[PDB]
Amino acid sequence: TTTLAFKFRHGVIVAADSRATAGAYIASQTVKKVIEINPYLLGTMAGGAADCSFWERLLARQCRIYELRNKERISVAAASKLLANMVYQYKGMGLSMGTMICGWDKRGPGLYYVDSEGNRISGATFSVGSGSVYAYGVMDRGYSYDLEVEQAYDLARRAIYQATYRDAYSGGAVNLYHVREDGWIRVSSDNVADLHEKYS
Amino acid sequence: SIMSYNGGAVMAMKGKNCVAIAADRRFGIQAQMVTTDFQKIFPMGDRLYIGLAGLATDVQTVAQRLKFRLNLYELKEGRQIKPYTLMSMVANLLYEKRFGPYYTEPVIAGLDPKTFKPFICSLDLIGCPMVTDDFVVSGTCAEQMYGMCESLWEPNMDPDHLFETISQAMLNAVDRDAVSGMGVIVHIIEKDKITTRTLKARMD
Amino acid sequence: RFSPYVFNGGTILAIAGEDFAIVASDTRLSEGFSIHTRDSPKCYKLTDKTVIGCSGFHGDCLTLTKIIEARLKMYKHSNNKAMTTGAIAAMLSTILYSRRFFPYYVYNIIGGLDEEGKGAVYSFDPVGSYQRDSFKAGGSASAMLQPLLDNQVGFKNMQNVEHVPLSLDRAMRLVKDVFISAAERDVYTGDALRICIVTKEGIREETVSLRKD
Amino acid sequence: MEYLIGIQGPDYVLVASDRVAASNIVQMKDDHDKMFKMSEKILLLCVGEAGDTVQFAEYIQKNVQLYKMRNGYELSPTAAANFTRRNLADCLRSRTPYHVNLLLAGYDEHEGPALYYMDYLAALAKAPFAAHGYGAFLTLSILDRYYTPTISRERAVELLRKCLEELQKRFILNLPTFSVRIIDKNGIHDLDNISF
Amino acid sequence: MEYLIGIQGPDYVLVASDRVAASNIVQMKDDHDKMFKMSEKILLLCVGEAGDTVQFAEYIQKNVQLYKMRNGYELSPTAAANFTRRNLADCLRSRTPYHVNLLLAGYDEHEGPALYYMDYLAALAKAPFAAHGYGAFLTLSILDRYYTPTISRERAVELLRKCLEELQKRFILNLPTFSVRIIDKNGIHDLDNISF
Amino acid sequence: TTIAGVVYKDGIVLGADTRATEGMVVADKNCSKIHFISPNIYCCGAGTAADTDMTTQLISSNLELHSLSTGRLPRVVTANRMLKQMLFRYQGYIGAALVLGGVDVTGPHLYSIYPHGSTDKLPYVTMGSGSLAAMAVFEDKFRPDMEEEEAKNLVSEAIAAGIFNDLGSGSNIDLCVISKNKLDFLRPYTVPNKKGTRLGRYRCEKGTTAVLTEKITPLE
Amino acid sequence: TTIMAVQFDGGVVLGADSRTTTGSYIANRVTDKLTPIHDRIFCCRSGSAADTQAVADAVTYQLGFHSIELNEPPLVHTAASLFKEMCYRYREDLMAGIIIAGWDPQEGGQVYSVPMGGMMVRQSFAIGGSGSSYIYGYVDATYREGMTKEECLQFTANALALAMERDGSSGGVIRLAAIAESGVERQVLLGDQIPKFAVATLP
Amino acid sequence: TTIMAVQFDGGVVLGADSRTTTGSYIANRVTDKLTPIHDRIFCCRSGSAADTQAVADAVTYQLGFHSIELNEPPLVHTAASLFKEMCYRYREDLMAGIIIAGWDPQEGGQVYSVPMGGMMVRQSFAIGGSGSSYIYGYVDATYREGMTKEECLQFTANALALAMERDGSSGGVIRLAAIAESGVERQVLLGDQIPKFAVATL
Amino acid sequence: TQNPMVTGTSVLGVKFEGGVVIAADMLGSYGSLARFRNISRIMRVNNSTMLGASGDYADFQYLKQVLGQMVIDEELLGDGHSYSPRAIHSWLTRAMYSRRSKMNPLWNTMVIGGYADGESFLGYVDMLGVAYEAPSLATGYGAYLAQPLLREVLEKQPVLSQTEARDLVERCMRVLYYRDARSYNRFQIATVTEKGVEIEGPLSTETNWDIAHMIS
Ligand SMILES: *[B]([O])([O])[C]([C][C]([C])[C])[N]C(=O)[C]([N]C(=O)C1=[C][C]=[C]C(C2=[C][C]=[C][C]=[C]2)=N1)[C]([C])[O]
Ligand SMILES: *[B]([O])([O])[C]([C][C]([C])[C])[N]C(=O)[C]([N]C(=O)C1=[C][C]=[C]C(C2=[C][C]=[C][C]=[C]2)=N1)[C]([C])[O]
Ligand SMILES: *[B]([O])([O])[C]([C][C]([C])[C])[N]C(=O)[C]([N]C(=O)C1=[C][C]=[C]C(C2=[C][C]=[C][C]=[C]2)=N1)[C]([C])[O]
Ligand SMILES: [Cl-]
Ligand SMILES: [Cl-]
Ligand SMILES: [Cl-]
Ligand SMILES: [Cl-]
Ligand SMILES: [Cl-]
Ligand SMILES: [Cl-]
Ligand SMILES: [Cl-]
Ligand SMILES: [Cl-]
Ligand SMILES: [Cl-]
Ligand SMILES: [Cl-]
Ligand SMILES: [Cl-]
Ligand SMILES: [Cl-]
Ligand SMILES: [Cl-]
């Protein structure tokens, strides 16, 4: 897997590949690794497929309950914290999860990295998964807070693409989302083979 | 597993008065692709090719050590080696290392240099030979390869059909294997020519 | 070390059509180098609209299918309607995850009709990860069947071919072909192929002989 | 932990390597050189286990030089790469394996510039660019993103610098300085070290 | 990997900590803060295993703030140190041990400045200066060499800088920036980050 | 693998299946497991295939050197000794499990030979992962001094038992019948298994596969 | 396996069961565990089939060559010594529990045990193999000084029958041999001929 | 240890050796392995001394209480059932090879084996413990249907003596008991009174 | 049970027209030692159902106790309903699975035969909860030595008479005595038909040892 996200002037870009594997067997090329927690909050999945899906679905449940009880949107901080507090209890039991919680709340664009080891950290950019090292190289050389919207799309797409090229465990399609002040949008889905054609 | 460290896949296939041999092009170390034009199929004669998958170091070693022995064989004898005789030469080489083997499992494809009859075989890493009249496969996606070849192969295929079958068997097989692919090369061996193609292929 | 698992073989397959779903499996049940029986299907009717294929450790296949049956009735009692194909899939995901720390050793594929009468396939890993698919192979020979389905149903790696709708007749031919190919090479797959065809009119059953070696 | 990188253009090969020699938590040397001159137009860059790396590289170097003395002309980059591979592979299953990872960069009169990659198993690949060490994980995609076969040497040094900056930013180890050399028709040229 | 340092002068305690959050070969955050404000005049600096570190420090922090709310005045740096210790020690042999190493810095109206050191086993030691992490191995002897009990805060920041420069020179990890805070009679003050 | 042998009134019948597996995948549907030792001696092999191939070839070759020298038809006991002394020397690391049968100047003889070098001389034996299925048939049905066709029926039934009950065994039944007067190497004897009929045409037209690069190299 | 040999005035009687096992599969139900080493000297074999066959063939060779050289029948004690030397020297690589018995003109009927490890000891009678555990009490109660050949045959057949009933690794038929100046007489007790002792069912 | 019991018409005979070992040190050379569980019901114990003592005391308690409640002598079959329940339930934590034998008015003399693992089977006669291995062939050849009490005593004493000579973990004295309607008669065979069988010298 | 102690070997079963026959030797082995040579490894469960068990005999006696008590409980009600063979096979599958799922198996492999409502029932359950039905079954070494012979006969003639099924079982028991080193030549045959469950024994097979003189 390769997932990335970054904050910038115009919100938060979120992108992922779509491959799943069982050892070296390619189990799927069409996994949705960006989960719609609510209309203003996305979670990304890397690591154990069942673990990520379950715990992010549970997070969506809890955020929704929260919203009902409190009569307001959960913050990115609080959502990411709910997730960390849920998984902390399982440390050492072999869960494997690395997620980015991406939104826009009263503090503006929000991005937290949360994993099954117990880390929870806010930051400007992150990449997670077996391909992350490859995505970081490209993302880091092109990233700027003042990226224009379309440049930010290009960067995310290209970083995931390049990761799919080097990392045997990333592939399929690049799926790209943009969190804006009034909600996330799905921006594109591009098969890596069609991107290959384009970038040469 | 030692044989999955570099990944990779080769197959060979028999038609009507022709043979085909194919391989992926990736050289990678566990998850990391290093190169996309790694050679796995080596000429052993005008109409006789060996394909090796397994640990890349041994792929190279075996190909080079085999060539050493073959060249000596051909200089000493009158003549070009016969396919079956190459098989036996390779069997002997591998079985010498019975107790510390090379980690490669070759396939051989060619035409008898006098009679032009098609020949294909594979061997395991200690040199057990297996001749077949249809296809042979070796590599990290052998199951995928077997599925494709069992479903598509037919007897008596002409060069064009043989090419389409070996190509489609390879592409679709390696597209279910994380550590094989990054391109596919195919050689079609006929009496009067060798045709070498690289295929449009997924690069993930 | 008592081991609580053993591998019992079996291949499964589902295909979604416009207005049908196929779920198919072989009928061999194996252990070690032996055959327990030649007549043990891996498909189970859940509703008029939903069939499930299960392979892996047979002790878990039996238990899990019995759990699913009970839960379908509990749902129906508490909500006054049968579970949909999609709700069965979602529920199965949670039942698998409940054993996250002692898993059911089962590969599951659901085939059925969705709420618009279209074919639906959902495929699972043993701890409950899943998604919708157009087709899927599972179990012992899955690596052998999957690539061919990718190519022939997905049209992958093919140029100059019209991406036509999958007819039931062609889907049927494909299913019989791939299992026959699998019986050639997977030692666990053989004896017979059982095919369930789910349509608006109900669920019908075909059986095809496979090699017994 | 040790970083090697190479970039081959039309008529040169550019190479760089970190200058740290580490032991446990400390850098013990900050001006270390991981490059070995084999001939006028060949550099071997070697990393891996202590002892093995120098013993191996110097053995190769002496034998390449010996070849020159016996025969009055030098081994081609390709021939030297294969010689290097024969030795490594022959030692792999022996009582004395060498745990080393290598690049071999050279320029041949007739074949032009060449860059070879070798791992400790003795798999040999020719490549237009390549890198070794954990740092490779963070830089190979930078090279995939920007490299073109006709890349000029000025832009290669720039591309190299982007790689090295990415290590300063993102890599967990402190690699503050790098040796940089280029090889072309006129031999081996030392460039300024790239430093932070 | 994580570095904490403290230096106590006559009427203040200076503390600093690296700003990296690492994972495998990469820095994932370069502006990380390892300090937790417990009260107006108490900082807890906490490193160790992921999850344990925040879960532990925030539990202490909430309870110290609770103590303020219940009682209308704050726990002394020494009380809070012993409260922290009691918790860590009571968890040591439980089903939920916390794998964390700490410093506790504070200023009391009557006792003056204090710096406490605690390891994951929950041994507590009061010290004139101290440090945690692999970086401590390279910097404690710098502190032993130049610290005096009457050291002024300007020279403490200089002394701190010597320590941090020694990491840049000698330590294999890339720790380029540090948070620096001081505590005295008037509370907690943020100083400029020390950066390279 | 299922391999087996019987002594009948006038000779030996050896039998084998034709499946070779790699893990739990069939690699070869038509492996030949009944190996030539000398014109009057054959040897079925089970266990590690390279080992049974190379071991039988080596002993056959040494026996041909022996008979060239002695000018006589080789003895079964000689093949047995050579095999077992070599297998013993290698301490079971050569994984050849063999059924050795032939006819020499002293009549028919049959031995089973194990990888660690023990042998048993017996009027019927089986080896391989199917050997208990094949042995069940023999215990139930063997009689001394069978006629040729009864012996052949019995062996092929035993091999069939292995074929159908052992996942390691399959495909065809080969027999080899060896008497004073005759050698009948019957490959295949029976073909009890056949691939099902390929229900779809997939007729992949020229151009279906996209090509990046092409080089034609002509030859003479 | 269960093996046994008994001395009498003028010779020896030997006996074995006939079961070879691999795990609990019977790979030979009619094994001949009593192997001639020379005209009037046999060994009874237990433990590894491969090992005891290799060692017996080697000793046969050594003894045959020695005997031609000396131009006399070999001593039983010599055959035992040769087994002992090979079983002791290679005690780390062999699993062999052996009984050597036979007749020679100098010392008459003799029985030697060479158990695992490679010690050697002469005895009036010997038992070995996995099944021998179950007959120690029986042989110790039943042995008498001065038994005739026929008594030694019956004693042996009874002991082995008892062991075979109880030891899962022993069974099949009972092979017996008697060795004396006059030669070697071999026979097989099978089916109904094996001595029979009721299962002690409830009154 | 070697333990044995034998049924006769009217009662049972029980026997044991008297050796307790820790490794190959003899921690008691005159152990009493035959323990009364009720007036006419004994158990012979082998395996762990701690386990079989704790289990026997427990079953003695259960059986005594049951017997007072019913106001009748307990069945031998009941005593065996109670050992079985405890030896089966705790089979993973106990090392206990037991023989239960005795007399009751309903079924007369009875012998039950409760070997390790906790199965229970009635038998004409039973043997157990490490030394029993060496007397299977002897008891199988020598046992006859219809032996008298006296014959059972001699048969038991001989079997035990043979086992004791061969089994390093058995030895010392032979304790015997006969149980019948009339009561329990115990005795010890020591030294010269133990049956004797020559070492087979050349 | 973590470690089996006294154990039984194969159990065989085959359906025939009007019933089911099962067979099991009478041995409890303690490792290689043929220790208890007269124990029954077959249970009459009720009138329509019988069970035979391989594996740990104490665990079998526990199952027998439990199952016997369940049948008594049900009979007490006198309500016209009885556990069918299939119900008992279901119960047994759940009980073994459940014990397997607590990592504390009952160490047995079982064959359930029955006859109810005109149908022969024959079902297998193992210590892991693997369960299925088939026209013939054989546990332990019987899976390798007896099942091939049962299946071969059944393929030529799927419907056997009672006497044919009995003879076929006897031939299988002989093979087992020849080739399983934990078998014993003293066995029971249990049969269930319309009339109920009959257990016969102790039975022995004839054996042939002519091959003992065919070595030279
Ligand atoms: B990515 O991190 O590489 C990707 C993330 C995404 C959420 C799918 N992760 C995976 O592909 C993981 N794969 C699985 O978890 C997986 C896929 C198929 C089967 C199984 C399985 C689980 C339990 C028992 C058997 C099989 N797991 C990762 C690569 O492992
Ligand atoms: B007796 O000691 O029980 C008997 C005596 C022997 C014939 C001299 N020993 C055995 O039956 C032994 N069996 C074998 O040695 C044997 C025979 C055939 C094959 C194998 C084998 C060994 C290793 C791996 C696979 C097969 N062993 C003994 C008790 O096992
Ligand atoms: B018999 O089974 O050999 C005999 C029967 C017993 C008296 C009922 N058992 C033993 O002698 C066993 N010995 C003990 O159980 C024993 C006695 C005293 C101390 C210890 C001991 C145990 C653990 C650590 C230290 C000491 N064990 C014997 C066969 O184990
Ligand atoms: Cl997708
Ligand atoms: Cl809430
Ligand atoms: Cl943070
Ligand atoms: Cl060579
Ligand atoms: Cl050669
Ligand atoms: Cl021989
Ligand atoms: Cl085999
Ligand atoms: Cl036998
Ligand atoms: Cl011994
Ligand atoms: Cl012995
Ligand atoms: Cl016991
Ligand atoms: Cl006992
Ligand atoms: Cl004592």
Ligand SMILES: [Cl-]
């Ligand atoms: Cl009994």
Ligand SMILES: [Cl-]
């Ligand atoms: Cl009953």
Ligand SMILES: [K+]
């Ligand atoms: K098959």
Ligand SMILES: [K+]
């Ligand atoms: K033998």
Ligand SMILES: [K+]
């Ligand atoms: K026996």
Ligand SMILES: [K+]
């Ligand atoms: K005691």
Ligand SMILES: [K+]
């Ligand atoms: K003693």
Ligand SMILES: [Mg+2]
């Ligand atoms: Mg691939």
Ligand SMILES: [Mg+2]
């Ligand atoms: Mg990829």
Ligand SMILES: [Mg+2]
């Ligand atoms: Mg088969």
Ligand SMILES: [Mg+2]
């Ligand atoms: Mg070394």
Ligand SMILES: [Mg+2]
């Ligand atoms: Mg913890």
Ligand SMILES: [Mg+2]
């Ligand atoms: Mg050995």
Ligand SMILES: [Mg+2]
């Ligand atoms: Mg205890």
